[PDB]
RNA sequence: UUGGGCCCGGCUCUUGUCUAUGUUCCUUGGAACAGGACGUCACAGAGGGUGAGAAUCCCGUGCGAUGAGAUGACCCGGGUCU
RNA sequence: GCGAGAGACCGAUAGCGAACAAGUACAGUGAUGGAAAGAUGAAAAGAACUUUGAAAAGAGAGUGAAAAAGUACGUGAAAUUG
RNA sequence: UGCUGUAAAGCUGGGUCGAACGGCCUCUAGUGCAGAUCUUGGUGGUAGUAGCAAAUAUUCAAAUGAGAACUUUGAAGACUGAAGUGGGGAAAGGUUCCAUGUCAACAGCAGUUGGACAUGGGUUAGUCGAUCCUAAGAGAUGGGGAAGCUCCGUUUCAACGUGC
RNA sequence: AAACUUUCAACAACGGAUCUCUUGGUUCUCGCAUCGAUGAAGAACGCAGCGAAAUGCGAUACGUAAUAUGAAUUGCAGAUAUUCGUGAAUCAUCGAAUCUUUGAACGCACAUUGCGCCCUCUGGUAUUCCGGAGGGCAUGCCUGUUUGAGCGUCGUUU
């Protein structure tokens, strides 16, 4: 997940199994006022969603890792 | 297969999760009996029926 | 004694030519009582004579 | 060849989980519950299946409400609040 | 099956008669249980008594002609005799029987 | 063990609201640090507190309620009693103890005395 | 001959609190709760626990006493207002 | 069903099928079928340490009233075996 | 270790053991086993025996390791021979996938290896499927049967638009 | 004569009888009347600092409130936890709540986490499109309200 934040500009997130990919873009701009370019969803073997979301270039992935503390 | 319904999926899940050994600190536990898990499953030998 | 002891068994005679004694076995498979005698007062599981 | 090689051609379940009971008892063509007789609105039991009766009754589950009708009976159905001791 | 000179016996127990048992282990529970009762409903009403005064009667049948017994109730007649309404005498301990 | 339930009965619908934002944010952070303690117990009474601040808006929004409704002939159906089905079913007092004229005539002319005997 | 409403009681039900007398001496034993000696209480020598058979070590038991909640057109006794 | 008190009842192949994570594990497409399985010791005090061994283990030692109680645990019969 | 009794049996010495148990007068019964192709559990002889023989076939060296016929790598010898022993999928399975560790059990020899065991990781869609359509068919409603569980019927003897 | 076979004894095995226990069962008695559309019984999936099950619970998830009580919990860990006290633990009690997806199960459908429509608020340059939040839309029957239909029918006017 931690190469995706840096290579990709994508964050990672485990996210609620009931919510879709415009409730998860809302979400990330109200809790870490980030822009997604897009939400990739995924159920995990486990029963848990995950999501891969990708900032546009006008955010730095690394840096809101950091500010969320994971990195 | 492959191409699996989302309530079947579901069930497989669990059944993963139910498939673990005892996490050993419950054997130290007072007046603890149970010495392993005793409903584990391989995917070749018992059959899931779902 | 409960008036059901030792019948609560769907057990079945497997009837002669089958090398076992006639007393009834339990059906089915897949556990260690499947084919085990039942109803019988020498059964192990089964009803006591004349129960009380 | 009805038996091992005619074995060897079963693939196709008769029966999926069923969605009140979920016990795999629902046929798929008949799109009834063998076990619990889903979708009618009574649940299938029959008198002269007395060791089915006990394995799906009141008491086999959480019993989440009938818990406590005992309970809220011996205290006469109050209604309101505790009121604390001066 | 028919064997000997002994009396020829009617035993009906040809039916699941097992199934229709009714042993009567609560006899001296019951009898407690009564008297409690019995208690409970004199100490509600004392001192009225917990008996309504019951008429004597002759018993019926050529049989028991000559014995005598309580009735069920004062025929309409009879308190009529003394005065007293079959209405008021249910509520003063007497019992009225219209049918009698 | 965390908050005080009297001390957030005497706060106000924003005062609340306010204080649960506060608390998500902080279990958010601590599921951030989980990951690398990775047991952490103060999980459990962040947890615990927005459950009490949640229970006590819910409680205050119901009496609020409660007193918009209160004598009114109709109210929502979770703030009447809940005592059970046949219960509900049953024949108010005032309805039980409803009686003809003609029975209430007699009740009163016959009523049941009270004697004694032997006197 | 006689209507109705409340207020305190009683009854009924549930529930809280409270209560006698050895852990004295010797022997065995890892442990005394065993044996022996001297006792104490008993309306309590039911039962359980405690390192072995414990009335007297602990909880209880027996005896009652005293609070809280309920409940009742269709239980009664008083008040009290119509 | 809920709440109690009992017994010339059974005592783990008995008593409910179930004294145990029992309507569990497991079988069957399905309706259904359906077990086995209680006991170290008062207390883990569940054997520190040394030594041989790749290890499992063994031999010393240690704890314990007892290791003729080491969890493959009270007692430890017979068949069968060295 | 013996004693007593015709006997069923009773008593006793030694060893083992650890919490209850017996004699006598009576009461009571789920009260006595060699058998029932008895029941449940356990154990033998057979017996270190039958056997572990289809699918052409293996060998040398090094590495690893306590240990190598069987693991890894290299060299060789072979085979499947494109209607494959190749590369994918549907059904079915469900984590068997991958990495690391790992050998008590399992892989009817072995095992350092494994689809085993343990710990983690892993499945990203506006365009690929489902989703939608109707097929044989299944089946509510209005009705009509049936004591009823329910049966018939599918626009049907209906005032049928949650219309545009 | 060994070996081997058989018998016996001692010790060691195999196995789990016997003995002794027992938070279980069975039977009898006494007392009580309390499930559900205010959504039951049941099912599925989740929830703990470290849990697979059982037990408990429902995104407030081994629980929230309240009343009582009065120093724990405990296998380890840990307080932005507590001790002459609004105070540890507590299904002790329990009257306030929460109560996922379902289920008689109710918008339609369901081998799908499929597809609608209405109201209020809100985001995207929007009465109409897309997104989000909250609240709604089943059937039979009863009482009532409103709007209707029928030369079934009464009165009146050409
Ligand atoms: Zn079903």
């Given at each position: 997940?931690?190469?995706?934040?840096?290579?990709?500009?994508?964050?990672?997130?485990?996210?609620?199994?009931?919510?879709?990919?415009?409730?998860?873009?809302?979400?990330?701009?109200?809790?870490?006022?980030?822009?997604?370019?897009?939400?990739?969803?995924?159920?995990?073997?486990?029963?848990?969603?995950?999501?891969?979301?990708?900032?546009?270039?006008?955010?730095?992935?690394?840096?809101?890792?950091?500010?969320?503390?994971?990195? | 297969?492959?191409?699996?319904?989302?309530?079947?999926?579901?069930?497989?899940?669990?059944?993963?999760?139910?498939?673990?050994?005892?996490?050993?600190?419950?054997?130290?536990?007072?007046?603890?009996?149970?010495?392993?898990?005793?409903?584990?499953?391989?995917?070749?030998?018992?059959?899931?029926?779902? | 004694?409960?008036?059901?002891?030792?019948?609560?068994?769907?057990?079945?005679?497997?009837?002669?030519?089958?090398?076992?004694?006639?007393?009834?076995?339990?059906?089915?498979?897949?556990?260690?009582?499947?084919?085990?005698?039942?109803?019988?007062?020498?059964?192990?599981?089964?009803?006591?004579?004349?129960?009380? | 060849?009805?038996?091992?090689?005619?074995?060897?051609?079963?693939?196709?379940?008769?029966?999926?989980?069923?969605?009140?009971?979920?016990?795999?008892?629902?046929?798929?063509?008949?799109?009834?519950?063998?076990?619990?007789?889903?979708?009618?609105?009574?649940?299938?039991?029959?008198?002269?299946?007395?060791?089915?009766?006990?394995?799906?009754?009141?008491?086999?589950?959480?019993?989440?409400?009938?818990?406590?009708?005992?309970?809220?009976?011996?205290?006469?159905?109050?209604?309101?609040?505790?009121?604390?001791?001066? | 099956?028919?064997?000997?000179?002994?009396?020829?016996?009617?035993?009906?127990?040809?039916?699941?008669?097992?199934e229709r048992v009714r042993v009567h282990f609560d006899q001296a529970?019951?009898?407690?249980?009564?008297?409690?009762?019995?208690?409970?409903?004199?100490?509600?009403?004392?001192?009225?008594?917990?008996?309504?005064?019951?008429?004597?009667?002759?018993?019926?049948?050529?049989?028991?002609?000559?014995?005598?017994?309580?009735?069920?109730?004062?025929?309409?007649?009879?308190?009529?005799?003394?005065?007293?309404?079959?209405?008021?005498?249910?509520?003063?301990?007497?019992?009225?029987?219209?049918?009698? | 063990?965390?908050?005080?339930?009297?001390?957030?009965?005497?706060?106000?619908?924003?005062?609340?609201?306010?204080?649960?934002?506060?608390?998500?944010?902080?279990?958010?952070?601590?599921?951030?640090?989980?990951?690398?303690?990775?047991?952490?117990?103060?999980?459990?009474?962040?947890?615990?507190?927005?459950?009490?601040?949640?229970?006590?808006?819910?409680?205050?929004?119901?009496?609020?309620?409660?007193?918009?409704?209160?004598?009114?002939?109709?109210?929502?159906?979770?703030?009447?009693?809940?005592?059970?089905?046949?219960?509900?079913?049953?024949?108010?007092?005032?309805?039980?103890?409803?009686?003809?004229?003609?029975?209430?005539?007699?009740?009163?002319?016959?009523?049941?005395?009270?004697?004694?005997?032997?006197?």
């Amino acid at each position: 997940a931690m190469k995706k934040v840096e290579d990709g500009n994508t964050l990672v997130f485990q996210v609620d199994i009931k919510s879709n990919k415009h409730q998860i873009k809302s979400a990330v701009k109200e809790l870490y006022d980030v822009d997604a370019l897009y939400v990739n969803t995924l159920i995990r073997p486990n029963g848990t969603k995950k999501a891969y979301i990708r900032l546009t270039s006008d955010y730095d992935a690394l840096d809101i890792a950091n500010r969320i503390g994971y990195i | 297969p492959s191409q699996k319904s989302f309530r079947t999926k579901q069930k497989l899940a669990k059944a993963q999760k139910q498939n673990r050994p005892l996490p050993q600190w419950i054997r130290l536990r007072t007046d603890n009996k149970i010495r392993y898990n005793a409903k584990r499953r391989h995917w070749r030998r018992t059959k899931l029926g779902i | 004694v409960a008036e059901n002891a030792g019948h609560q068994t769907s057990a079945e005679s497997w009837g002669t030519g089958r090398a076992v004694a006639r007393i009834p076995r339990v059906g089915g498979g897949g556990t260690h009582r499947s084919g085990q005698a039942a109803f019988g007062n020498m059964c192990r599981g089964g009803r006591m004579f004349a129960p009380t | 060849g009805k038996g091992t090689p005619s074995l060897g051609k079963r693939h196709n379940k008769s029966h999926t989980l069923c969605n009140r009971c979920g016990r795999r008892s629902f046929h798929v063509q008949k799109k009834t519950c063998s076990s619990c007789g889903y979708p009618a609105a009574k649940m299938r039991s029959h008198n002269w299946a007395l060791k089915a009766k006990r394995r799906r009754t009141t008491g086999t589950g959480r019993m989440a409400y009938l818990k406590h009708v005992t309970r809220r009976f011996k205290n006469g159905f109050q209604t309101g609040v505790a009121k604390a001791q001066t | 099956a028919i064997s000997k000179n002994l009396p020829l016996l009617n035993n009906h127990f040809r039916k699941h008669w097992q199934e229709r048992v009714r042993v009567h282990f609560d006899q001296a529970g019951k009898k407690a249980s009564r008297r409690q009762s019995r208690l409970r409903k004199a100490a509600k009403i004392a001192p009225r008594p917990i008996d309504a005064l019951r008429p004597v009667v002759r018993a019926p049948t050529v049989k028991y002609n000559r014995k005598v017994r309580a009735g069920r109730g004062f025929t309409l007649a009879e308190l009529k005799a003394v005065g007293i309404a079959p209405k008021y005498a249910r509520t003063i301990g007497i019992s009225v029987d219209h049918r009698r | 063990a965390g908050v005080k339930t009297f001390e957030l009965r005497t706060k106000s619908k924003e005062q609340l609201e306010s204080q649960l934002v506060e608390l998500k944010q902080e279990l958010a952070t601590l599921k951030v640090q989980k990951l690398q303690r990775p047991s952490l117990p103060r999980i459990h009474t962040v947890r615990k507190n927005i459950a009490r601040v949640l229970t006590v808006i819910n409680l205050n929004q119901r009496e609020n309620v409660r007193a918009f409704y209160a004598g009114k002939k109709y109210i929502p159906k979770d703030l009447r009693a809940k005592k059970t089905r046949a219960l509900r079913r049953k024949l108010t007092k005032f309805e039980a103890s409803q009686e003809t004229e003609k029975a209430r005539k007699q009740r009163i002319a016959f009523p049941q005395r009270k004697f004694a005997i032997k006197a």
